[PDB]
């Protein structure tokens, strides 16, 4: 009836075309304008095996994103390995938007809508389709922001979480918003303030989560060992600026625990800097940009997922030890893309 | 011909810190981790901790994590490990390993071990 | 893990060495020579790679992975370590009976 297959894509958007922002003027020209008729159908009594890990629209997307940030951002200096780009750094406007992608003829995209589907393995509730959900491409570390959301429960989807090596995404089914804001009128500081309350009841729900699914031992969660800031911190782009938020607080382990009433609950305010010396994504390197603009700077995005590593290693005792995740923005991709599966049929 | 070497044992003191380097040819050091393995005279392996080079992603075994820091260096394409605090136990032979094109574990690739001698 | 300390076995006969402890995640088998870094042997269960001979064998059918090497040589003078992931068991040293 049908085989499993990879392919060239093409993007969909909606982005008006007279719009100075970067991510519209890349689509524009990028992405053909949306199908105001979409339709997608049910397939009727059919199993079908997905795996999320290895499917190839994350590395197209991967492909795009990178070709976005290239063509639109444009660092004061570059340097890669023994070379070095000088090349003036405009000011930019910089929002991402929800793009889209489709196949052409003789492809078409599969989408599981199991509510508990993992990521891999069986579903029994598939449908096929043309065209993907609205897809921001933002970059985030530890943390995944302004995404979709679970559905009926918080998911923990990986490769293997047998493994220590391979990253844990997990999927929230209530958004946390996180505001961060740098004041008008030190240009570099700023500061993320996220409401303790609810951050901790979906933090405890995860723990419980992760208890079911690791014989109920005592769950930890820890800030990370070491790497360079782009990881160490949360690391994400707002208006153009690259800002780096210390999360130690984000991982209290007491707030959870049974203190009752203590000195958590409250609006935890965690520091952030915008650094113009950074580590690019797209490749190994460095990128130096302009100093920060005046006035206000403010983003509040809705948290939506986490990234997380299992420590692990003769653990023999009551206790798995965590600590976020990031690195790898496939990963970050793969947490949108695990409902779809390319597909041919000729 | 994946070859990667260690340069960086030796003979120390009580408590103070030593420093390993591993150095690859074969491939491009950022693709696959980096594992470190010590090995007690006559005794079986345990595993420190790996590295992913990328951005420095480090990952750290609870009996070691606050002791060791694993750290890289692209350009010159070499690991590092650096164990800070050693004991008498510490006494060793220590391995970076790395694993197949793609996934980290298990072990195919050993580099050649390093002796560590904790002294007085 | 699971694992003997020390075996032995004549040349020429069969000889196996189950590491057991696995929770059932694959196996990996190590053979060393003490004195050097060790050298895998076979990966993945049933497979092994290149540059070792069929006179080694293997099967993982849950908790006890098996390792089966029969016309025992004198480079079989070895300790030979079962792997899961970052654990390795004991190890077992195996030598001739000269």
């Known amino acids: 009836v049908w085989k499993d297959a990879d392919t060239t894509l093409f993007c969909a958007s909606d982005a008006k075309a007279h719009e100075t922002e970067v991510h519209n003027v890349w689509a524009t020209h990028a992405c053909v304008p949306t199908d105001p008729n979409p339709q997608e159908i049910h397939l009727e009594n059919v199993t079908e095996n997905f795996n999320m890990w290895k499917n190839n629209m994350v590395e197209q997307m991967q492909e795009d994103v990178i070709s976005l940030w290239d063509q639109s951002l444009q660092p004061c200096v570059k340097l890669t390995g023994g070379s070095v780009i000088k090349q003036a750094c405009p000011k930019i406007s910089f929002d991402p938007i929800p793009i889209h992608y489709c196949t052409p003829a003789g492809y078409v995209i599969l989408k599981c809508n199991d509510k508990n589907f993992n990521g891999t393995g069986p579903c029994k509730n598939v449908s096929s389709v043309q065209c993907t959900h609205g897809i921001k491409p933002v970059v985030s570390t530890q943390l995944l922001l302004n995404g979709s959301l679970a559905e009926e429960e918080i998911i923990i989807r990986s490769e293997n979480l047998t493994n220590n090596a391979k990253t844990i995404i997990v999927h929230l089914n209530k958004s946390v918003e996180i505001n961060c804001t740098r004041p008008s009128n030190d240009i570099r500081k700023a500061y993320c303030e996220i409401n303790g309350t609810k951050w901790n009841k979906v933090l405890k729900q995860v723990t419980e989560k992760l208890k079911e699914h690791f014989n109920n031992k005592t769950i930890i969660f820890q800030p990370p060992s070491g790497g360079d800031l782009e990881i160490t911190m949360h690391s994400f782009n707002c208006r153009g600026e690259f800002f780096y938020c210390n999360t130690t607080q984000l991982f209290n382990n007491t707030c959870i625990g049974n203190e009752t009433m203590k000195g958590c609950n409250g609006t935890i305010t965690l520091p952030c800097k915008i650094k113009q010396i950074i580590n690019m994504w797209q490749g190994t390197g460095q990128a130096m940009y302009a100093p920060p603009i005046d006035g206000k700077i403010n983003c509040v995005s809705n948290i939506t997922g986490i990234l997380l590593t299992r420590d692990g290693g003769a653990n023999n005792t009551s206790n798995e030890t965590f600590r976020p995740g990031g690195g790898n923005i496939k990963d970050n991709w793969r947490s949108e893309l695990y409902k779809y599966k390319v597909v041919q049929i000729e | 011909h994946v070859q990667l070497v260690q340069s960086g044992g030796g003979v120390k003191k009580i408590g103070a810190a030593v420093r390993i380097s591993c150095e690859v040819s074969?491939?491009?050091?950022?693709?696959?981790?980096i594992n470190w393995v010590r090995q007690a005279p006559g005794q079986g392996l345990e595993w420190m901790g790996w590295?992913?080079?990328?951005?420095?992603?480090?990952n750290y075994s609870w009996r070691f994590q606050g002791r060791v820091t694993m750290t890289r260096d692209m350009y010159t394409d070499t690991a590092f490990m650096e164990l800070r605090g050693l004991r008498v136990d510490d006494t060793a032979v220590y391995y970076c390993?790395?694993?197949?094109?793609?996934?980290?574990?298990?072990?195919?690739?050993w580099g050649q071990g390093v002796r560590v001698v904790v002294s007085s | 893990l699971t694992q003997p300390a020390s075996m032995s076995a004549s040349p020429g006969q069969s000889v196996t060495i189950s590491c057991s402890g696995t929770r059932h995640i694959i196996s990996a088998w190590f053979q060393q020579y003490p004195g050097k870094p060790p050298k895998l042997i076979i990966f993945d269960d049933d497979k092994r790679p290149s540059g070792v001979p069929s006179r080694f064998s293997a099967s993982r059918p849950g908790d006890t992975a098996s390792l089966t090497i029969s016309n025992v040589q004198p480079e079989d003078e070895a300790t030979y370590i079962c792997?899961?992931?970052?654990?390795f068991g004991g190890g077992t040293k195996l030598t001739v009976l000269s």
């Open positions: 792997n899961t992931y970052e654990f």
């Open positions: 074969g491939y491009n050091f950022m693709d696959q981790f």
């Open positions: 590295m992913n080079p990328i951005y420095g992603q480090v």
């Open positions: 390993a790395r694993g197949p094109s793609g996934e980290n574990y298990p072990f195919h690739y």
